[PDB]
Amino acid sequence: RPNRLIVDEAINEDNSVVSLSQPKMDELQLFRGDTVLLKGKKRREAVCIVLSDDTCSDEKIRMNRVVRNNLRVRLGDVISIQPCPDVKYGKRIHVLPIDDTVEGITGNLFEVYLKPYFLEAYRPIRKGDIFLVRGGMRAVEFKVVETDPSPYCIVAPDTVIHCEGEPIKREDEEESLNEVGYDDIGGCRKQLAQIKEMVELPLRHPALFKAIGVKPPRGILLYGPPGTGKTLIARAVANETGAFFFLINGPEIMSKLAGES
């Protein structure tokens, strides 16, 4: 698997660049100015542009702090890189400022920061990303909440942007689908062990399990006293193995409207 790659510090400070060694780009058949998808932990995705670098080792990827925050990784970790040549030119985006960066600015952000940054830049961005802009005296932090088309886009001169709105906070609700894992579970050692034993294989490697020809489990009933936190168990398992946990509540399904439930 020539996709796992260790990380390293960056030389250039551009947000949307990664430094690659020449043999690696030869092996993966990537050319300069193209777009690739970077996937890591916590189901975090990013888009970047491949750049050349002789100094960097073949197994090492040179990459800066903002991408590391976006991917929720650290130094010495592993990141997967995949090609993405179907990147789609965007039409309209909505960008908002973070709460603790616009204290005492009281100005138009379109021309001071956004226009100098996005001119002839061709910077691809994805929904939910956090990026920094250096200007006069403050490092303004911005969040992308929507893009057309979603989630992949490229900033172009003939695009319309909207940055008018209240300064949004940092996370608010982005912790339920986040770091919560095995470290936030107590008093369930045996049951968690059994669940991990009977669920790890059919979710991590589905193709091999299909190839073998053995029926996977189709239903599990976690029964016990209320308030023990079973939904947190399921959320932790889904967020750890890697899935699309989709919660369905009882009462809201019941009383929607007569026969439309």
Partner: protein, 225 residues
């Protein structure tokens, strides 16, 4: 309950001023109030004489007689039933755009009809509108009557074949499909897969003539180079 008034009011603005027009012009021709000979878009007289009334009026008339009314009825039905869909989606928040594209289509079709010797005009424009809708709503599923499961981006060709086999006159649908495809390139596909600069910008005087909606994300600006 006057269903006529309520139904007319429920019709969206632009189509309300188009539909009625194309069902009112033929009557004048059929009742003989105005001579139909002045309503056939003769190209040579248009070139030599002024004949400014020819293009605006010749695109709204179709003689109806013994057994030619069925094509008119089905064309009008498709026009209404798909122009409502075209206004309610896609071209929804841009009333000027739905009008600018119609004028662009009309200019192109009158140019190519002056080049050719075609008499009538509404059918190719209807085909162009239908095609520009169909190319935008791919991967759907619809059926006319016989439980058929044609997906999308085929219906213009299907009705092309339907008109072709049952009768003739195939040029005045190809000439509309080509114009629709040209508009689709010049509006959506070209400055979206290569990055070329926009060549179709709606003038601001249309916006001052007809106001736009209030966008969800406040108001936006164009970057440029």
């Amino acid at each position: 309950m006057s269903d006529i008034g309520d139904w007319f009011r429920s019709i969206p603005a632009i189509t309300r001023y188009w539909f009625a027009a194309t069902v009112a012009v033929p009557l004048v021709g059929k009742l003989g109030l105005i001579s139909p000979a002045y309503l056939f878009l003769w190209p040579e007289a248009f070139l030599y004489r002024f004949q400014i009334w020819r293009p605006i009026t010749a695109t709204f008339y179709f003689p109806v007689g013994p057994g030619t009314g069925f094509l008119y009825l089905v064309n009008l039905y498709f026009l209404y039933q798909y122009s409502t869909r075209l206004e309610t989606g896609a071209f929804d928040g841009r009333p000027a755009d739905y009008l600018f594209m119609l004028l662009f289509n009309w200019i192109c079709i009158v140019i190519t009809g002056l080049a050719m010797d075609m008499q009538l005009l509404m059918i190719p424009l209807i085909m162009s509108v239908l095609y520009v809708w169909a190319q935008l709503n791919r991967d759907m599923i619809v059926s006319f009557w016989f439980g058929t499961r044609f997906k999308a981006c085929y219906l213009p060709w299907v009705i092309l074949g339907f008109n072709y086999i049952i009768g003739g006159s195939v040029i005045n649908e190809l000439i509309g499909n080509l114009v629709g495809h040209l508009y689709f390139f010049l509006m959506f596909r070209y400055p979206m897969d290569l990055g070329g600069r926009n060549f179709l910008s709606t003038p601001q005087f249309l916006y001052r003539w007809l106001p736009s909606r209030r966008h969800n994300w406040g108001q936006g600006f164009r970057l440029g180079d």
